[model samples]
Target: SISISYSTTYSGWTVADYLADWSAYFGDVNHRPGQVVDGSNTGGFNPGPFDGSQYALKSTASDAAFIAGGDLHYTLFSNPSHTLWGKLDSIALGDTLTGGASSGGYALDSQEVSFSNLGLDSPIAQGRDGTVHKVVYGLMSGDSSALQGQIDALLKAVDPSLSINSTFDQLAAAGVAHATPA
Candidate 1:
């Protein structure tokens, strides 16, 4: 298993807050931290990325490296990207990162939530808001099929005149038809 580690601090945040924001973005895909993608033919290892609807090959490194001060630092058992991705191998909550801080009010925002974190290895790029976003996107496609129904209900509940026919990508565009946020 490959090991990936990184840590960033959010000025006024705790591990719990970071986790909640992530959970909200990925939602509950088969009870996993990251959403599950079709990955049927995306590209990656010999067997491809996804083996089942809720399964993923994960890393398992000991002393790992993390992006810090603009460069990756090598350390042991100090970040979730280390133990979280390395020691775990599942698609459910077991497959998601659980810690790190470094700037906030970014990762969970609607725009950044569109990134995917599904892959054979973890990402080295900075998080959406800056740091702590971690390997969120790429792991899962915006498989909004499961979420569309709820979104539709919500849109209708908010306004009967609002209608939607496109996928998640279009939901944002359709916002033009909605009442402005209060």
Candidate 2:
């Protein structure tokens, strides 16, 4: 938990002063309201010397800091030198019967799972557009597997780079193609 001492004025309410005081008292300060990697504009504290500015004030004054303590920090701004990775929490067959990846060892995305959720009658079994179609576990008679195959192909194309066995350094060293957002 974090505490604040606000006076609605800058003179008596310095963020640095507050953080320093609180840390001295609490002895285990989580973080100070500074340029938290993913804060507004990433400018840290504006007005020189990283003083309490509008951005810092908002982030510090709100629950963004506490609510976004650990994983959110990395999610917002990972170390530029490190490789990026993603996780798939769980997967559903567009219906109910959720199952994990049969391949890739974890039922995570980038692979397929058994589609035995939607009554086991329709093609692909799950909802293609999230509607209850009359199919289960396998592809329907008329639906083209082309789209699925294309997506499969794309996954296969990137699999070499995204295999869990490979580390970021290993991927980079092997010259595998990858993508990152700006």
Candidate 3:
């Protein structure tokens, strides 16, 4: 599992204000103006901010744009770290669910963070006005697949007759921790 967390502060704005402006806030960051299809550029050009004119977010299979409510929006970018513009990798705009006084800030923490192989941008940082956000995330090196291979090797060593189809539960049933890499 990978762990990640990030926070952003809003100046002169309540949590309500932040939530209310969620769509505009995220949309602004997602916006990518002037592209080949837009007839604005040929193939190579410098990336820049949206000038508030009509422009579509770069359509791609790894990217998503959505506004779930008048005040809630989310966008996911699979490879923002290496993309030229390196837009917000993934952002959920809203107030924290926990009951607390409005500190004019929002945050997210998760273990299922994704990595981008295509963008040079940092996976966890965005800012506006006095508000700045940063993310801290890392993978556990080996996931289920890697663990499975290690388990297979271990099982084979113990019993050549053991079935290769052993499940993780089966391996654990033998008192062997199977989630760690070899």
Candidate 4:
């Protein structure tokens, strides 16, 4: 097995801009733009306003379009902190979901809380203005996937019915202790 690592930077994202684009594209046309109505509607993704778009989707395969940004890159390493020759991974577009090279690292924008700290409504999350499925398409994996999974699982362990939408506030309100990073 090869050691894989990831990283990303917060170039720029705005809910107002995205929402404005959305309004221009869909709201003005009653949710029916040329992309949505005629073509595959595979419009680009936007990340902002504390939405789930920041989450990685199933389409983030090994050879996508680098949708996150032009500067994103990744590499296989023998150690978590050691670089095994820096290499860039190509990002695939929405159409390249079935068979693409997506087995690379992840990136992040406005990294406030740890990736382990993100849930559905966390500030670190992505796209909130009606971009449900599209919201999660372009997430950066700069954070620790292993740590995030463990944290998410431990939090969910206490309450099995906890949905992703269930925020930390709700968890705290329910008396669940804040499971800090190990």
TM-scores of all predicted structures = 0.22, 0.16, 0.18, 0.22
- Residue-level lDDT tens digits of model 1 in 47-162: 21211122222212211111111112222244433321211121222232322232221111111121112222323332232222223122233223322333344445545653
Q: Model 2: which ten-residue window has the lowest total lDDT?
A: 66-75
Task: Determine which window of 10 residues in candidate 3 has minimal summed lDDT.
Answer: 130-139
What does the lDDT come to for candidate 3?
Answer: 0.24
Kindly provide the TM-score of model 2 when superposed on the true structure, using C-alpha atoms.
Answer: 0.16
- Whole-model lDDT, model 1: 0.26
**Local distance difference test scores for all models:** 0.26, 0.22, 0.24, 0.26
Model 1 TM-score on a 0 to 1 scale: 0.22
Assess the local accuracy of residue 89 in candidate 4 as a C-alpha lDDT between 0 and 100. Answer: 21
lDDT by residue for model 2 (1-182), tens: 11111222222322233323332322222343431223232112222231111111112221122100001001123332111112111111111111212222111111111111111111222224211121110112212132233223333355543332333233334444222221
Residue 111's lDDT in candidate 3: 13
Prediction-by-prediction clash tally:
21, 14, 7, 20
Give per-residue lDDT, candidate 2, residue 131.
Answer: 19
Q: lDDT of model 3 at residue 22? A: 37
